[PDB]
Amino acid sequence: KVFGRCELAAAMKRHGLDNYRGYSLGNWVCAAKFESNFNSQATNRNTDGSTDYGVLQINSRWWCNDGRTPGSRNLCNIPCSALLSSDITATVNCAKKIVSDGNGMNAWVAWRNRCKGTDVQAWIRGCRL
């Protein structure tokens, strides 16, 4: 599913992500834009052989099981394919865990490089929330 900016904003809000761990909605939406272009079906393999899945590109090395990442941890207890669904629930639940992890949203390299320190509020502007 390729989400609309405001559509995703609203779903993420409904799923309790706004201000989750201090990160306003705009951050979440900004990261999803740059991680996957709002496409829930997005996948990207990495050099270590792991793969990133979904709108927030959660990694198969620690977070989800994909059957082909040796030494995977499956911290979120789910198969990676669950992260590609049009329903953002599994993505949201897993993201909550990751962000609570210690480095916050720095966990997401596009966030750190492209969102952090910017006027992220631009990302939910005009939306009806």
UniProtKB/Swiss-Prot annotation:
State the disulfide connectivity.
6-127, 30-115, 64-80, 76-94
Give the CC-aspect GO terms. cytoplasm; endoplasmic reticulum; extracellular space
InterPro entries in alphabetical order = Glyco_hydro_22, Glyco_hydro_22_CS, Glyco_hydro_22_lys, Lysozyme-like_dom_sf
**In which tissues or organs does this protein occur?**
In the egg white and polymorphonuclear leukocytes.
Q: What is its EC number?
A: 3.2.1.17
- Record localization: Secreted
Q: What class of enzyme is it?
A: hydrolase
**Where is the C-type lysozyme domain positioned along the sequence?**
1-129
> Which parts pass through the membrane?
none
Q: How does it assemble?
A: Monomer.
Q: What is this protein called?
A: Lysozyme C
